[model samples]
Target: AFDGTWKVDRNENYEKFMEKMGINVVKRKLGAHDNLKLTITQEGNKFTVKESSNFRNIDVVFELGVDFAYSLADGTELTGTWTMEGNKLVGKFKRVDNGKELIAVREISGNELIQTYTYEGVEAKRIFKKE
Candidate 1:
């Protein structure tokens, strides 16, 4: 399923979306075309994701319903948990600095992996293709 490496192909309303997230303009510009890639694997309820981009590289492992700390390229930090909801991977995170919610979701469609982010009522999507 979502076990392969995925490369970002495009973004939807990401500029304004990150703006709402308080991401600075310089980082925002770089983030739009970050050439981000994600290598994901899952075993039972445990999940591991290797994230790589022009901005940073990190390996994250967490189990369903278990919270972990994750950081954005702009240095914003969040604590979150990912759980299976229907056919989607739903993640809910709160900013460590301000304690606001940042919800994200991942869904598979054909050969595409679509990751969506919603924060402060603004939603954006970054779709990826298998690599």
Candidate 2:
């Protein structure tokens, strides 16, 4: 399953999606090159994600279909739940500040993992290669 280390390869339309999330230009620019790496461990319905980036390192733990709070590196708070649909992990989160919805999905294709985010109307994709 999603139990491995994945390093970001590239992004598509991420700046616009971050803009929609109200991130400033400077932070967005730096974030574009954050060099994010995610190490995921799955134990049945529970998952632990160790996230490391140029900005910070944090661990996120959650159970499938259970709501939990998470914060972005820029300290943007979100409340969400991730559910499995087929081979995809679908996440639906609401911004704690503005109460706006942010949708995310993760799926593996070939040797890469694709993570997509949608905020407001903008959609972005961040592809990661298995490490």
Candidate 3:
């Protein structure tokens, strides 16, 4: 399960996705190399996520199928919920300011955790390795 620390190793077309999200070029550049790491623990229906990166260190807690408010690194507010579809964790979020839908899906393949995002028709993937 996704119950351990994972560190981002690489990304695919993430900058373009960020651009579609209206993030500034400088912020996108910094975000690409943020060295993001996540320590995720799941207890029954509750999830506790410890997020660490060059930009910030924070904890995000949510329960499956429950909506929660989260802000982007650039201060964009979003409301979302995560649900399990098969073995994948799929997130559906909407930008609070623009009401645009953003989708994030996490799946584990072998020893890697792959998270894919979709926003404004742009799709990107960020892969993480077990730490």
Candidate 4:
């Protein structure tokens, strides 16, 4: 289970994923090193996420099987639900601006939290260490 705060460490192919999302070169460049952070608090099936980065800060609250809206720093909007699969927190979202699908998965390995993002056929990973 994923709980507590995690900061982004490294990314893999995130630029490609951003490209598929129509993010510009400049924003994509900065986003790659934005120092994204997530603080998650969960109670039962409900979760509250406090997300902060160089680009923006936002709070997201949602429950499992509930659909909600979220926006990226670049103004891309997504509507989705967070679900659980075994020990992984799986997210399925669709971009409201371009009608594209984005999938995210969260898992923990030892003391590290790993989150993977997939847009179209491109995939990227953001790894975080507990703070």
What do the candidate models score in CA lDDT, each in turn?
0.93, 0.95, 0.96, 0.90
User: Which lDDT tens digits does candidate 1 get at residues 1-131?
Assistant: 67889999989999999899988889889989899999999999998899999988889899999988988877789999999998899999999999999999999998999999999989999999999
Q: Please report the TM-score between candidate 2 and the true structure.
A: 0.98
- Measured by lDDT, the strongest candidate is 3
Give candidate 4 regions above 4 Å deviation.
none
**What is candidate 2's lDDT per residue for 1-131, written digit by digit as tens?**
88899999989999988888889999999999999999999999999999999999999999999999999989999999999999999999999999999999999998899999998889999999999
- Report residue 115 deviation for candidate 1 (angstroms): 0.5
Inter-residue clash pairs, candidate 1: none
Candidate 1's C-alpha runs over 4 A off are none
What lDDT tens digits, residue by residue, belong to model 3 across residues 4-109? 9999999999999999999998999999999999999999999999999999999999999999999988899999999999899999999999999999999999
Give the 10-residue window scoring lowest on summed lDDT in candidate 1.
67-76
lDDT of 1: 0.93
Off by over 4 Å in 2: none
Report the Cα lDDT for candidate 3: 0.96
Of 2 and 4, which scores higher on TM-score?
Answer: 2
Candidate 4 local Cα displacement, residue 21, angstroms: 1.3
Better of 1 and 3 by lDDT: 3
Clashes of each: 0, 0, 0, 0
After superposing candidate 3 on the true structure, give the runs of residues whose Cα lies further than 4 Å from its correct spot. Answer: none
